[PDB]
C-alpha cells in the first residue's frame, strides 16, 4: 500500500460510510477516525513541519499523492517508491487497537505497595 | 480592522515584500512573520478546534473572510460584526515586540541569592 501513513489516511471515508449501533459505537468509530491521521502527523512532525497542515493537504489531494518527508514535497508515492507492506500496516493497527481499547475500559487499578 | 486575529494575518504579504539587510534581519523578519499567526491560532485553540488548519484556511480565503469561533464558521467579518480597533492591535504588537526582542538579546542573567 502507500507509505508515509497515507494508507491509513485513505481509509477514513470507509469510516464515514459506517452506521453506528448506538452512541458509544459512534464514539469508538470517531476515536479510530481521529487515530488514523496519527502516523502521517508523526512522520511530518519529526521532519520539522506542521503535521496537521500536511495531513489536510494530503486529504485534499488525489488518492495517489502523498508527502515525501525527505524531499519535503507532495509527490506520487508509488512512482517515488514510498510504499509500505499491507501486513505491517494492518498488524500495527490491530495490535494497537485491541490493547488500547481494552485499557480504556478500566475503572479500578490495583498495584502492589512498593517495598 | 478585522477581528479574530485576521488583521495581523493579512499583513504577512507586507513582510513577504521586505528585503533584509543581512541574515539576522532575515531571522527577525521570519520571527515576526511566524508570530503574526499566533492570535488567530490561540482564539481557535480556545474554541476546541485545530488552530493551524483554521489559520491556513483563512490564508487561502479572500481578504474579507475570517473565522467566527463563536459560531465555528468562516464568514465575512465586517458583515458579522467581528471587528477590532486598529489602535489596540498595533499597540499590542508594538508593546510585545519591543520587550520580547530585547529579552532575546540576553547572554548573562544576574539574580539575588534567595535568603
Ligand atoms: N521518504 C519518506 N517520506 C514519507 N514517509 C516515509 C518516507 N520514508 C519512510 N516513510 C514512512 O515512515 C514509516 C517508517 O517509520 P519507521 O520505519 O521509523 O517505523 P515503523 O516502521 O513504524 O517501526 P520500526 O521502528 O519497528 O521500524 C512508514 O510509514 C513509511 O512509509
Ligand atoms: N466571535 C468571534 N469570533 C472570532 N474572533 C472573535 C470573536 N469575538 C471576539 N474575537 C476576537 O477575540 C479577541 C478578543 O480576545 P480577548 O478580548 O479575550 O482578549 P484581548 O483583547 O487580547 O485582551 P484583554 O484580556 O485585555 O481583553 C479579538 O482579537 C477579537 O477580534
Amino acid at each position: 500500500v502507500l507509505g508515509g501513513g497515507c494508507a491509513l489516511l485513505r481509509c477514513i471515508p470507509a469510516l464515514d460510510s459506517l452506521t453506528p449501533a448506538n452512541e458509544d459505537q459512534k464514539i469508538g468509530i470517531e476515536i479510530i477516525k481521529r487515530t488514523l491521521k496519527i502516523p502521517a502527523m508523526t512522520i511530518a512532525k519529526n521532519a520539522g513541519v506542521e503535521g496537521s497542515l500536511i495531513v489536510e493537504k494530503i486529504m485534499q489531494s488525489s488518492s495517489e499523492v502523498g508527502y515525501d518527508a525527505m524531499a519535503g514535497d507532495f509527490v506520487n508515492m508509488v512512482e517515488k517508491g514510498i510504499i509500505d507492506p499491507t501486513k505491517v500496516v494492518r498488524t500495527a493497527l490491530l495490535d494497537a487497537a485491541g490493547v488500547a481499547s481494552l485499557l480504556t475500559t478500566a475503572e479500578v487499578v490495583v498495584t502492589e505497595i512498593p517495598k
Side-chain angles (χ1 to χ4, degrees), chain A:
Chain A
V1 292
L2 295 180
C6 286
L8 290 186
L9 273 190
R10 299 313 181 175
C11 298
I12 292 163
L15 285 84
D16 290 344
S17 62
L18 264 191
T19 292
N22 53 62
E23 188 62 32
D24 300 285
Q25 308 268 321
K26 182 179 183 293
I27 285 163
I29 290 158
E30 289 321 292
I31 281 166
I32 291 306
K33 202 178 306 175
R34 281 178 301 207
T35 309
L36 281 193
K37 329 164 170 50
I38 290 302
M41 287 181 184
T42 313
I43 289 157
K45 188 200 140 169
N46 282 358
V49 308
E50 178 70 47
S52 60
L53 304 177
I54 300 288
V55 170
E56 198 49 63
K57 166 72 174 71
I58 289 169
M59 289 180 182
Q60 289 152 13
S61 294
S62 285
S63 277
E64 78 266 348
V65 169
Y67 182 66
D68 186 18
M70 268 312 258
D73 290 321
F74 286 96
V75 296
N76 188 297
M77 304 292 260
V78 163
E79 291 173 9
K80 284 318 181 94
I82 317 177
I83 43 176
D84 277 4
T86 308
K87 184 160 181 278
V88 170
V89 176
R90 66 165 181 83
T91 291
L93 180 67
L94 197 69
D95 279 303
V99 179
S101 58
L102 189 73
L103 161 65
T104 56
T105 56
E107 189 57 40
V108 180
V109 178
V110 190
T111 65
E112 296 179 355
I113 293 171
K115 294 191 190 71

